[PDB]
Amino acid sequence: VPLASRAACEALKDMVWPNAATVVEVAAWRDAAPATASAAALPEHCEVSGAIAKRTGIDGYPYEIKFRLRMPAEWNGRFFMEGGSGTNGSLSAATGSIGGGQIASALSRNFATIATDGGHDNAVNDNPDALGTVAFGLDPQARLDMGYNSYDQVTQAGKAAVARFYGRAADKSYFIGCSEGGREGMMLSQRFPSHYDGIVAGAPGYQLPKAGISGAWTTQSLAPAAVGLDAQGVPLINKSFSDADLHLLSQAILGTCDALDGLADGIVDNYRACQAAFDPATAANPANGQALQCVGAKTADCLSPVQVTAIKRAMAGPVNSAGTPLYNRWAWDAGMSGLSGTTYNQGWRSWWLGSFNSSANNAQRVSGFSARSWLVDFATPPEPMPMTQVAARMMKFDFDIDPLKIWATSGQFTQSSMDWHGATSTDLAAFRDRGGKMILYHGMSDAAFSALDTADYYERLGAAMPGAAGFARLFLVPGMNHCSGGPGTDRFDMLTPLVAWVERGEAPDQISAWSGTPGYFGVAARTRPLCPYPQIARYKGSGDINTEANFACAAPP
Ligand SMILES: [Ca+2]
Ligand SMILES: [Cl-]
Ligand SMILES: [Cl-]
């Protein structure tokens, strides 16, 4: 009987679930866990885990929506869900990750926390004939679960357990996710406006079905600059640029752009002015004052004209024969490379190129999971094929025929992948008018999703909803790669300003951040403010350039 107790916990295994097909597998009491070097202390709590809507898909495979929920004995009254990543399919510890490379989890701050696998299981839904762990795309309902339904079901189940376990409903609910988790957050704001009061959506894949389009585009754009072929005769896209070549490119970007914010410090805060000024075909190598593009043959100090032509085309984004942009363009930024000690940053090049030191293609968008996901999860009908065919399929991508498939329905696939996965709506009025607050962030050197495309969504949001900065703000991060890493201030506590905005009405005029790898700048630490779009961080003119107190958020100089 007694609330928030070990007995209340075990009783959850007369509990009425919102979905009748909810099956509790574990309801176990957990002692407090001390802090570790990489994780804050976890309070005493009830762990509930189980699944919703066990079934068999039309592919003969089993499917269910897994969840894991943790409810602390000492509870602050708030509910918290963390978002997913990749193509989901895994169930985390569900202590409420807040991203930003943070030590603390939401459970360590006495939230009740929940996580899902998105409706499929990478250990079970791994089909060798359907490109491995993306195979859930062969089941229409599993697609719908991945797009929106799993997070809806798990939110309802979690809130129901909270109300039963504590004798009262959550005062406020919070959702934080990055990447695929960021798409989920935007989706919740659009499709389920009252599920969460506060949403953090980092590097959000809100047009994820278009990623494979960009992937085929960057693959074909980079092929003229590749050197060699892989085991099935596909150009080695990873050989198009060495790490030294990419570092040369970012040094050229810094040469053109670093000081456009007023401070030569290795960070391009004035990203708009950089885009307008930088052209690798006209820019100079600052180390030697010569043109970045070779006049003669290839040296370590220049880039071949084919290299320059290739990267420019990849960064421009895909079009069809009519010239219509199919996704968006990408921003030149220093975080495309980076050097800390003797280690080159791999956090940008792994997406479109892959590791240089390999005899095979391994880029996410050439032969990796992104290309695989587009083929089976997002094309309708799905296009399963052997793993060794994926790279060739990207080289033969037809930008007039293939991009239509993310909008198509076929057979039992009664929704398009943009229908169930896309989160492009700017109608956040219901969300805003019940008190919802949303923090978006995106690293400028993200090669998975374009930071400029997030910016264009924010522009459209501001136009559809005048005064949108009162409930939704965007924080771009110079130098940061996808969700983390790179030469920028990629670490931040987003949960604290989110709670302040939701509950005290305090909008974040800036968000403190620090660099996880300050070696990129040759310093022991760098702290900087993140600034709400379209402001940027501006140095005050005096003081240590690595200290956040010497910076302020303002317009570009
Ligand atoms: Ca700068
Ligand atoms: Cl993290
Ligand atoms: Cl100082």
Residue numbers in the entry: 43 to 55, 60 to 603
Sentences from the study reporting this entry:
Two α/β-hydrolase fold enzymes (α/β-hydrolases), PETase and MHETase, work together to degrade PET in two steps via MHET, yielding TPA and ethylene glycol—the building blocks required for a new round of PET synthesis. We have determined crystal structures of recombinantly expressed and purified I. sakaiensis MHETase in its ligand-free form (2.05 Å resolution), MHETase bound to a nonhydrolyzable mono-(2-hydroxyethyl) terephthalamide (MHETA, 2.1 Å resolution) or to benzoic acid (BA, 2.2 Å resolution) as well as ligand-free PETase (2.0 Å resolution) (2a−f). PETase and MHETase only share the α/β-hydrolase fold (2.87 Å RMSD for 184 out of 262 residues aligned).
Apart from the entire substrate, even substrate sub-structures and analogs such as benzoic acid or nicotinic acid are able to bind tightly to MHETase as observed in the respective co-structure and in differential scanning fluorimetry (DSF) measurements. Thus, substrate recognition strongly relies on the aromatic ring as well as the carboxylate function of MHET both guiding its positioning for hydrolysis. Inhibitor experiments with benzoate derivatives and R411 and S416 mutants also demonstrate the importance of the interaction between the carboxylate moiety of the ligand and R411 together with hydrogen bonding for tight binding. Consequently, the loss of the positive charge in the MHETase R411Q and R411A variants leads to strongly reduced substrate binding and decreased inhibition by benzoate in mono-4-nitrophenyl terephthalate (MpNPT) hydrolysis. The high affinity for compounds with a benzoate substructure is expected to lead to product inhibition by formed TPA when higher concentrations of MHET are hydrolyzed in vitro. This is demonstrated by the decreasing reaction rate for MHET hydrolysis over time.
